[PDB]
Structure 1
């Protein structure tokens, strides 16, 4: 499929950036997570980035560590995540869906089989957080065989060789890291380096989404103004889940308000 390509073409025609929330699948339970995701979409999410709970999420700070923990407390497994993904896609045919994976969950039981399942349920991209471009060959090859975009990360310090590799190897979107360290709203990153955003375009990279530390509408607006195609926010969204665990209706209301405000910032 061409879900990201279609999305970015539509947004470009409207001079608009993408706003892409991250949540952990099955946090705080399967049913509530499905409602959360429908709320994100209804509030204006252009695409989704969805984490499969993993025992050892080494690129995530405490907020997302705790989301993984909540999902495990609810008994969430990767098989249940794929059932959720199929349902989400059946409700929402055009929204791009990206997974945030750790390598063992992809490799476990066969890399090719993992990407085949992604294709079956209608996932559009997979970002394997602990596979750098240097180790990426079997992942990116399997992704492409199954019509899945492999997503790669461009650090703010990326040298020319790395930019060329990310531009060549990735598809769908290019993940532009706002800073070093791990996920977290508590740590704000930098503005996209115009050198990076411009080199990526020079090398015909997939459109850039900036992520890590994006928690306010002003940062969304700023990312787009710097030349990124959009912005991803995770911890800020997951914190609303965490704060409102005891109040599921209030949780959805606050998620709706927050996403609406973040999406509004991406408009020209």
Structure 2
């Protein structure tokens, strides 16, 4: 499929950036997670980034660590996550769905089989948080064989060699953690950049797009709303809807 390509072309036509919320699948439980995700979509999320609970999330801060703990507390397994992904794709045929994975869960039952399962349920991209570009070859190859975009992080400490590698090897979008970077990525024909550092308010969404990025990823702020409203699922959904609506509005021309 070409879900990212189609999304970016449509957004471009509307002079619009992407807004992409992250949540952990199964947080705080399977049924509630499903309603969360549909709420994000109905509020105007342009794509999703979705985490699978893992014992040791090396690249993640406190909010996400806590999301993981909640999802495990609920007994959420990778198999159940893939069941969820199939359901989500069945409800929503065009929205790009990206996973944020840890290497062990990809490698566990064979790397090729993992990406085969991704393709079967209708995932579009996979970011493997603990695989640097230098080690990515078998992950990228398996991804592309199964029509999955491999996503790479372009960190603040990126050099020119890294930019070229990220530009050449990534598809779907480039995950930016930051303006020089944005210009260089475009020069090297990289996948459109989404800014993923510190996107917690509408002004940062607008700032990302104004700087030349194709959009912005809210890496933790959505999870913060979950964590805050655990005792009140109805209010949780309410607050997610208004937050996502506001963030997406900020992306609009």
TM (norm. structure 1) is 0.93
TM (norm. structure 2) is 0.99
Deviation of 1:212 after TM superposition, in Å, equals 2.6
Q: State which drifts further: 234-243 or 125-134.
A: 234-243
Give CA deviations for 1:71-123 in whole Å, capped at 9, x if unaligned. 00100000000000000000000000000000000001100000000000000
Mapped partners of 1:86, 1:214: distance in 2: 28
- Extract structure 1 runs of 4+ deviating beyond 3 A: none
Helix, strand or coil: the match of 1:72?
helix
Mapped partners of 2:153, 2:29: distance in 1: 29
Mapped partners of 1:87, 1:204: distance in 2: 34
Give CA deviations for 1:120-158 in whole Å, capped at 9, x if unaligned. 000000000000000000000000000000000111221
Mapped partners of 1:97, 1:211: distance in 2: 16
Deviation of 1:228 after TM superposition, in Å, equals 0.3
Deviation of 1:234 after TM superposition, in Å, equals 2.6
Mapped partners of 2:134, 2:219: distance in 1: 26
Helix, strand or coil: the match of 1:209?
strand
Mapped partners of 2:144, 2:205: distance in 1: 30
Mapped partners of 1:57, 1:156: distance in 2: 20
Deviation of 1:195 after TM superposition, in Å, equals 1.1
Within the candidate set 229, 232, 235, 1:247 is matched to 232
Structure 1 unaligned blocks of 5 or more? 178-193
Deviation of 1:53 after TM superposition, in Å, equals 0.2
Helix, strand or coil: the match of 2:226?
helix
Structure 2 unaligned blocks of 5 or more? none
Say whether 1:116 aligns with 2:116. Answer: yes
Mapped partners of 1:235, 1:176: distance in 2: 15
The CA RMSD measured in Å over matched residues stands at 0.5
Mapped partners of 2:62, 2:176: distance in 1: 21
| Residue 216 of structure 1: aligned partner | 201
Count of residues in Structure 1 that have an aligned counterpart in Structure 2: 252
Helix, strand or coil: the match of 2:116?
helix
| Residue 29 of structure 2: aligned partner | 29
Mapped partners of 2:220, 2:181: distance in 1: 24
Q: State which drifts further: 234-243 or 92-101.
A: 234-243
| Residue 188 of structure 1: aligned partner | none
Give CA deviations for 1:152-182 in whole Å, capped at 9, x if unaligned. 01112211111000000000000001xxxxx
